[PDB]
Design a protein around this ligand. Structure first.
Ligand SMILES: Cc1cc(-c2cc(NC(=O)c3ccc(CN4CCN(C)CC4)cc3)[nH]n2)ccc1NC(=O)Nc1cc(C(C)(C)C)on1
Length: 285
């Protein structure tokens, strides 16, 4: 893994707070496996390492805790502690009661709630987290709505970057990947920029699958030939323009996340943008 060597040298197991297993209570499943837990009371999310897994997974599990614990930013999920001295091993994580962003968007579509400014705040939150990660030379490699988490559903919600770790050629999230990534296996901060553009599309489409009527292979051929997605319905031009800049064919021509964050902030200053009505779904279609 491209992050293990650096994290291993510059972060200690002693940095991880071992919580006695007796003080941890699993309350319910949320979605290895992830539970809502309680520490004696702190409310937490608990990721488990299934006992059937291997020694490579042992490393992967420890490294997830070490890597998360390395960061300190409001828009990146917190590691709260660990319980590695008991089986199955736990990682204790910030509980995000809003759930994943993709599910949130699909379930909160306006029906016969959300406003444009709400979407912009989510995008700003994640862009803020990405800028922090870029500034610390960390390449996420799977920026997507499915890996973004929300503190709560209502106003004042905060979005944060996580990684559920779901990512052969059939497992590649090709629809979030720039050409140099899915053709050459090259990952940089500018490949995260591309993915963020696709995340923006997800957000302002209110949770549609990217390239809705296309398979992965069709997208591969589409994108390598210069093809790009059209704007989501009712998407403001300034927002779409950010997407298309994230999707420049050459990474050198894509903005960094400092620029992306600035441009999103500018959108929140434009009444014509934030007063744009989101589309409304008519049941009978
Ligand atoms: C694995 C995981 C889960 C959570 C986690 C998940 C949760 N909530 C839920 O899972 C959940 C699900 C459903 C609902 C219910 N609904 C909400 C409201 N209702 C109305 C609709 C549905 C509520 C909460 N809270 N916390 C956190 C962290 C991680 N791990 C993780 O990030 N690792 C990463 C991170 C990194 C970076 C940052 C360096 C890239 O690298 N490794």
């Amino acid at each position: 893994n491209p992050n293990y060597s650096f994290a291993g040298k510059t972060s200690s197991i002693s940095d991880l707070k071992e919580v006695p297993r007796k003080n941890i209570t699993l309350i319910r499943g949320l979605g290895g496996e992830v539970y809502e837990g309680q520490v004696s009371p702190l409310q937490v999310a608990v990721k488990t390492l299934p006992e059937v897994c291997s020694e490579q997974d042992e490393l992967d599990f420890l490294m997830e805790a070490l890597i998360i614990s390395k960061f300190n930013h409001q828009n990146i999920v917190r590691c709260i502690g660990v319980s590695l001295q008991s089986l199955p091993r736990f990682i204790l994580l910030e509980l995000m009661a809003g759930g994943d962003l993709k599910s949130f968007l699909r379930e909160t579509r306006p029906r016969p709630s959300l406003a444009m400014l709400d979407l912009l705040h989510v995008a700003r939150d994640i862009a803020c987290g990405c800028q922090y990660l870029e500034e610390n030379h960390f390449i996420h490699r799977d920026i997507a709505a499915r890996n973004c988490l929300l503190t709560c559903p209502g106003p004042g919600r905060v979005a944060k970057i996580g990684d559920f770790g779901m990512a052969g050629c059939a497992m590649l999230p090709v629809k979030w990947m720039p050409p140099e990534a899915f053709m050459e296996g090259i990952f940089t901060s500018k490949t995260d920029t591309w993915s963020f553009g696709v995340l923006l599309w997800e957000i302002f489409s209110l949770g549609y699958m990217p390239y809705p009527s296309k398979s992965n292979q069709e997208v591969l051929e589409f994108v390598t030939s210069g093809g790009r997605m059209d704007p989501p319905k009712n998407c403001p031009g300034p927002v779409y323009r950010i997407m298309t800049q994230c999707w420049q064919h050459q990474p050198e021509d894509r903005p960094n996340f400092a620029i992306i964050l600035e441009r999103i902030e500018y959108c929140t200053q434009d009444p014509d943008v934030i007063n744009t009505a989101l589309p409304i779904e008519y049941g009978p279609l």
